[PDB]
Amino acid sequence: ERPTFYRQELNKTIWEVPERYQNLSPVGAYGSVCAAFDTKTGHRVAVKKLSRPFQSIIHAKRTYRELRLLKHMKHENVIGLLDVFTPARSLEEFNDVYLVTHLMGADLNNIKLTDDHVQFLIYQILRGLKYIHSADIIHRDLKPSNLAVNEDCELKILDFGVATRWYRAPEIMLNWMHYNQTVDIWSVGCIMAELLTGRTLFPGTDHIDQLKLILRLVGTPGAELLKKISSESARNYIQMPKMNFANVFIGANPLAVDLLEKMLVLDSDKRITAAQALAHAYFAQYHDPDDEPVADPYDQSFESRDLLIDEWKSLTYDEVISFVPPPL
């Protein structure tokens, strides 16, 4: 049943991996991540050694959460789990978790982009977000560095864990209660803007400067939206004119400007969803209602639980043991 592991020191870091994975080479920003050769598939992979996975309740829950989320994701435009392993033979000796994913070529932060490429890249993000959102999962940290492409411009959403705040929706700039899945659509708008102009749309130096730069584009809220804000601080802070997107994004595909106007809406209740955005004219070349799948249901009940490290650790171990490799 159990493979043969081999040990190796890489960054004064002990890596213990199955013989399956060869020629481990550190990729050191992304965490403890090595490019490896998978002798079973003949394809290169990424192997992530979780850092101090059971150091604390917080780490333990984070470890469990990352493994639960990765085991769930079965979509072309979302990072998926090829393998998860531990060198541990028992729950008793379980202290290290290794995750195996596809190796991606470059982050979108690395990559003048043509309108074709913007269309295809934002299409693939929305297709992935449709899937993630359908399981009631919110990304919450979409930014160029969390999006990866191969040379084929095939895109995957991931979360590696510059500034998040540049891409963050106004309604979660202060308090994290009154928000929905469309926080991720705001992020998609900021990314798409950047892809079209080669500039950060909203390079705020802090959470208040950020809100200033956003309002300068979308305009200060009307009475309609001001009435839906609970926080005296946030309301009293905000308490001018909406710019013509066609002026700001001069020379863009006018259909890219129209979609941007539907994505960068202050009122999160009126912001276009991933599903709706896919059906926008911009994506006429790439939209197929029969190849934009939704996810299986995702059991998120664990998010509400306050459990001990040994409880989170045992749950993670179960999820390692029950893992079913995807087909080749």
Ligand X SMILES: Nc1c(C(=O)NCc2ccc(C(=O)N[C@@H](CCC3CCCCC3)C(=O)Nc3ccc(F)cc3)cc2)cnn1-c1ccccc1
Can you say which residues are annotated as belonging to the binding site for ATP?
A: 27-33, 48
| Site for ligand X, residues 120 to 159, rule: CB under 6 A | 132, 137, 139, 148, 157-159
Q: In this chain, which of 17, 33, 211, 257 binds ligand X, going by CB under 6 A?
A: 33
Residue reference for tokens 């059971």: 54
- Residue 6 vs 298, nearer CB to ligand X: 298
Q: Does 106 bind ligand X (CB under 6 A)?
A: yes
- Residue 1 vs 306, nearer CB to ligand X: 306
- Residue 132 vs 183, nearer CB to ligand X: 132
Residue 324 neighbours by CB under 8 Å, 6+ apart: none
159, 269, 290, 296: the catalytic one is: 159
Beta bridge partners of 102: 45
Cβ at position 315, least distance to ligand X in Å: 15
Q: Does 295 bind ligand X (CB under 6 A)?
A: no
Cβ at position 224, least distance to ligand X in Å: 32
- In terms of C-beta density within 10 A (0-12 exposed, 13-18 middle, 19 or more buried), how is residue 6 classed? middle
Beta strands in 175-218 (DSSP E): none
Asked if 186 contacts 170 with a C-beta cutoff of 8 angstroms, the reply is yes
Asked if 264 contacts 194 with a C-beta cutoff of 8 angstroms, the reply is no
Gap between the Cα atoms of 173 and 15, Å rounded: 39
Q: Does 34 bind ligand X (CB under 6 A)?
A: no
- Residue 226: CA count within 13 A, CB half-sphere: 11
> Hey, how many other C-beta atoms are within 10 angstroms of the C-beta on 184?
27
Cβ at position 105, least distance to ligand X in Å: 6
| Site for ligand X, residues 185 to 224, rule: CB under 6 A | none
Point out which residues bind ligand X (CB under 6 A). Answer: 27, 30, 33, 46, 48, 62, 65-66, 69-70, 73, 78-79, 99, 101, 103-104, 106-107, 132, 137, 139, 148, 157-161
